[PDB]
Amino acid sequence: QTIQSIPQKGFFGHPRGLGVLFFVEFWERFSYYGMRAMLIFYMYFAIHQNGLGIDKTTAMSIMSVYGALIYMSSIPGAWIADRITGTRGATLLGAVLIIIGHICLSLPFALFGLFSSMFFIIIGSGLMKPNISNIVGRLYPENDTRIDAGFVIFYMSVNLGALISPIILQHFVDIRNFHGGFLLAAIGMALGLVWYLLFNRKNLGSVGMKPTNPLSKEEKRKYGMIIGIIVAIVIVVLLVTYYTHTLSFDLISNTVLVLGVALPIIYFTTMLRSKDVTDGERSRVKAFIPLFILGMLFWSIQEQGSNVLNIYGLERSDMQLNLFGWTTRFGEALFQSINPLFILLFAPVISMIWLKMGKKQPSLAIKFSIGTLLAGLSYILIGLVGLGYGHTQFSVNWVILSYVICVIGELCLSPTGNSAAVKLAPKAFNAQMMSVWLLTNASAQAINGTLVKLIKPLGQTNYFIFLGTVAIVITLIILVFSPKITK
Ligand SMILES: NCC(=O)CCC(=O)O
Numbered sequence: 001q002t003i004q005s006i007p008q009k010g011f012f013g014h015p016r017g018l019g020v021l022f023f024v025e026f027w028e029r030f031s032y033y034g035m036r037a038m039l040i041f042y043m044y045f046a047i048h049q050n051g052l053g054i055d056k057t058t059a060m061s062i063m064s065v066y067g068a069l070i071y072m073s074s075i076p077g078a079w080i081a082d083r084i085t086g087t088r089g090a091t092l093l094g095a096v097l098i099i100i101g102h103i104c105l106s107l108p109f110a111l112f113g114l115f116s117s118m119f120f121i122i123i124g125s126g127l128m129k130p131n132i133s134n135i136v137g138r139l140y141p142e143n144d145t146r147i148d149a150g151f152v153i154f155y156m157s158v159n160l161g162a163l164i165s166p167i168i169l170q171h172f173v174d175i176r177n178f179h180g181g182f183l184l185a186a187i188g189m190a191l192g193l194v195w196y197l198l199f200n201r202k203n204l205g206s207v208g209m210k211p212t213n214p215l216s217k218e219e220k221r222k223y224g225m226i227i228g229i230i231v232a233i234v235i236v237v238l239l240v241t242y243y244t245h246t247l248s249f250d251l252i253s254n255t256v257l258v259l260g261v262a263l264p265i266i267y268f269t270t271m272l273r274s275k276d277v278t279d280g281e282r283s284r285v286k287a288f289i290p291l292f293i294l295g296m297l298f299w300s301i302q303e304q305g306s307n308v309l310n311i312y313g314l315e316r317s318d319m320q321l322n323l324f325g326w327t328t329r330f331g332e333a334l335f336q337s338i339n340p341l342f343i344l345l346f347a348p349v350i351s352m353i354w355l356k357m358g359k360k361q362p363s364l365a366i367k368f369s370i371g372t373l374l375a376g377l378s379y380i381l382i383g384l385v386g387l388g389y390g391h392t393q394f395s396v397n398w399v400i401l402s403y404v405i406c407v408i409g410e411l412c413l414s415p416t417g418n419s420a421a422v423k424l425a426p427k428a429f430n431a432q433m434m435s436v437w438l439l440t441n442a443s444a445q446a447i448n449g450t451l452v453k454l455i456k457p458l459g460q461t462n463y464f465i466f467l468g469t470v471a472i473v474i475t476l477i478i479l480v481f482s483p484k485i486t487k
Pocket of ligand 1: 033158159162305306336337339340343
């Protein structure tokens with residue numbers, strides 16, 4: 001038994017192991033969301049300002065494509081643990097790769113440093129993210145009611161790291177010491193790796209030491225050829241385009257846009273066409289399709305807060321916080337701390353609003369629509385602000401007010417989507433359903449990479465009013481089918 005080899009207490013009433021992973025995840029998410037806060041500015045800032053001097057649209061496009069690929073990599077990375085290394089092996093190798101990625105940015109390699117960094121982080125975060133989360137769940141026995149609260153505590157390290165890292169790294173942006181800030185994230189991640197290596201054999205026992213579905217002798221040959229050939233085709237395409245001098249980021253953004261739109265269709269077609277899924281379970285897979293649209297329209301506007309909304313506020317607002325007499329210069333990296341702070345403060349509040357009601361609470365469709373409609377209205381607000389003022393430098397309060405409207409929308413969509421990924425899931429397609437919920441983010445981010453190109457032709461202000469209305473009109477159309485969708 002997996003439980004007969006591990007401690008069942010030791011961390012706020014949960015297995016001692018939950019304590020180890022909280023510290024490992026805190027330091028990984030801290031270095032990830034910290035590095036992410038500085039990268040956008042590191043890319044488009046001038047050479048004299050220690051930046052890379054990349055086109056505003058290209059730097060904006062790289063962020064959305066980087067993000068998409070991190071979430072897409074969880075699909076083959078959950079496969080490698082399930083079929084080759086086990087969850088422990090993939091977590092460890094993934095962590096070692098992430099460290100190399102942060103170190104790449106600390107070195108003066110400019111573009112070679114940026115692209116090699118991205119490549120190390122994309123691979124590592126696909127091997128580490130879905131498998132570290134798997135071990136948390138595996139620390140609890142079959143008939144153990146604590147597991148739900150264990151994940152609430154586990155995802156607290158996620159928002160703690162995301163909240164603290166941009167506050168700390170704001171000084172490294174101010175003094176233009178980018179390499180120093182990326183080095184801080186690299187060392188920050190090393191503390192995670194050390195804490196795992198020091199305290200993991202005793203707290204996590206034999207849980208995740210071997211794959212669940214190991215590959216047989218023939219499967220090692222079969223998959224080895226397919227993966228080997230696909231890798232070989234990619235290597236040549238990038239090398240031939242490079243030396244001819246025709247290689248650009250459009251090749252990356254277009255390939256990812258194809259994957260972003262193709263992957264959801266493939267999973268839904270596989271699940272629907274399956275002979276294992278019952279007619280009752282098939283109606284739930286059909287009912288999750290309009291929820292996926294609502295989830296994509298949400299994560300599209302929400303993830304633009306990391307590359308579009310923060311640059312808007314930096315360039316068009318006064319960047320001066322002003323609440324009831326208290327005034328201070330607002331840092332550009334501190335826009336990344338709004339969401340995690342509002343999740344930490346108001347997550348248990350919204351969790352109790354639904355508990356107070358019980359049977360009288362709204363459906364998954366009403367909840368998804370409220371979240372998407374708010375995200376849409378967040379873009380109407382900031383778009384109208386700019387339309388009203390124009391050339392007049394408005395307050396940073398209008399930008400912060402936009403971030404708040406979106407996180408209030410997330411507090412309705414994130415806990416609903418987590419329950420939807422497991423409840424609506426068929427018996428034989430539980431992992432395949434976890435993929436369709438996480439692909440709402442990977443697809444939105446893959447769309448964004450190309451959607452940022454429409455900022456220059458339409459205009460920065462007009463871009464906000466259009467995206468806001470596109471999200472609202474489509475959310476209201478799906479809302480007319482609220483009694484039909486609830487099956
Ligand atoms: N759980 C992490 C978040 O939702 C915060 C993302 C952000 O920093 O914008």
